[PDB]
Design a protein around this ligand. Structure first.
Ligand SMILES: Cn1nc(CO)cc1-c1ccccc1
Ligand SMILES: [Cl-]
Ligand SMILES: [Cl-]
Ligand SMILES: [Cl-]
Ligand SMILES: [Cl-]
Ligand SMILES: [Mn+2]
Length: 340
């Protein structure tokens, strides 16, 4: 039957079922005050689906100049066209090939550039902002968003939203690679999965996706959403509590040293955005430092709420279009304060 919510991560993750339920705040605010991420499903059913397709972005913006990133080695592909990314998003026979003749796994960098989303894409901007869940927290002028109400003693978010556009990781070797490496944000954010592209040509890449979720430590109920309801899984997240950030820095300093990196005792491996915690590193974090995380599979139309200060990493399973908006909740304003 229809229900207001359910739980993932063995009861540790709230999943809200109705993105426009005017009573969601009553369930949300207790989990949020405790420093937990939250998932909201069904946002895709509220959007104009024709605005969020890879073919539309190619047709409308394809002649713009852009840089790409190669996800396998972090190398920059300089001064190519927006269409060189979008036309290979699902059709593997159209992707830029590395010099080994394999199709590359690419990310579109800084697009739209800086704060230009609203000017470049006004119809998309309105469609996203009017359908965000928890609107008192997430709208630019929400009653519980302090972004526009704080003095310069607080770090304020840039004007959003921001897009995260990248191909899926494919091979067994790619299982230990990040789409986006471990980092943290001093603002809160909501990240919405607006499109999942399941490729063709080299399409039938279903079994390595299940091994990735299993080794990723996904709970048994999360595994039922694949096998039972057939929704499209986009990306595997690991999120850690803001309180655990220093213990994670202690682990990554120790591993940097073991691997022959030469680093001052105080350098910040989270701010560096150079690490992806693979199954080996995640087990070491739990066993050596006592730190547990949240393993989250983000399906089409899932909104992931990411607490200010919480370290997080993302591994795309298929090609994904995500759009995120920053906000400043009262529960987490301490994380952006510039003193003590
Ligand atoms: C309207 N609606 N739609 C869904 C999606 O499955 C869930 C609900 C919901 C809202 C309040 C109480 C119970 C359920
Ligand atoms: Cl907090
Ligand atoms: Cl638009
Ligand atoms: Cl709300
Ligand atoms: Cl990154
Ligand atoms: Mn982030």
């Amino acid at each position: 039957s229809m229900t207001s919510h359910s739980w993932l991560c063995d009861g540790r993750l709230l999943c809200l079922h109705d993105p426009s339920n005017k009573n969601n705040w009553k369930i949300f605010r207790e989990c949020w005050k405790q420093g937990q991420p939250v998932l909201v499903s069904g946002v895709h059913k509220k959007l104009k689906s024709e605005l969020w397709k890879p073919e539309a972005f190619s047709q409308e913006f394809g002649d713009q100049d852009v840089d790409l990133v190669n996800c396998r080695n972090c190398a920059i592909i300089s001064d190519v066209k927006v269409r060189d990314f979008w036309d290979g998003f699902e059709i593997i026979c159209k992707r830029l090939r590395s010099e080994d003749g394999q199709p590359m796994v690419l990310k579109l960098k800084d697009w739209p550039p800086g704060e230009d989303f609203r000017d470049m894409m006004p119809t998309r901007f309105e469609d996203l902002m009017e359908n965000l869940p928890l609107p008192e927290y997430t709208k630019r002028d929400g009653r519980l968003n302090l972004a526009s109400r704080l003095p310069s003693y607080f770090v304020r978010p840039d004007l959003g939203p921001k897009m995260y556009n990248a191909y899926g990781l494919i091979t067994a070797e790619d299982r230990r690679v990040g789409t986006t490496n471990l980092h943290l944000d001093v603002s809160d954010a909501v990240n919405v999965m607006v499109y999942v592209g399941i490729p063709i040509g080299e399409g039938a890449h279903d079994e390595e996706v299940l091994k990735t979720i299993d080794e990723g430590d996904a709970d048994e109920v999360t595994k039922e959403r694949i096998h039972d309801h057939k929704e499209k899984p986009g990306a595997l997240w690991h999120i850690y509590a803001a309180k655990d950030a220093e213990k994670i820095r202690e682990l990554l300093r120790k591993v940097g040293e073991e691997q022959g990196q030469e680093n001052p005792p105080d350098h910040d491996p989270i701010h560096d955005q150079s690490w992806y915690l693979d199954q080996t590193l995640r087990k070491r974090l739990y066993e050596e430092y006592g730190v547990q995380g949240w393993a989250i599979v983000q399906f089409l139309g899932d909104a992931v709420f990411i607490p200010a200060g919480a370290p997080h990493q993302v591994h795309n399973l298929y090609s994904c279009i995500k759009v995120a908006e920053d906000f400043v909740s009262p529960e987490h304003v301490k994380h952006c304060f510039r003193l003590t």
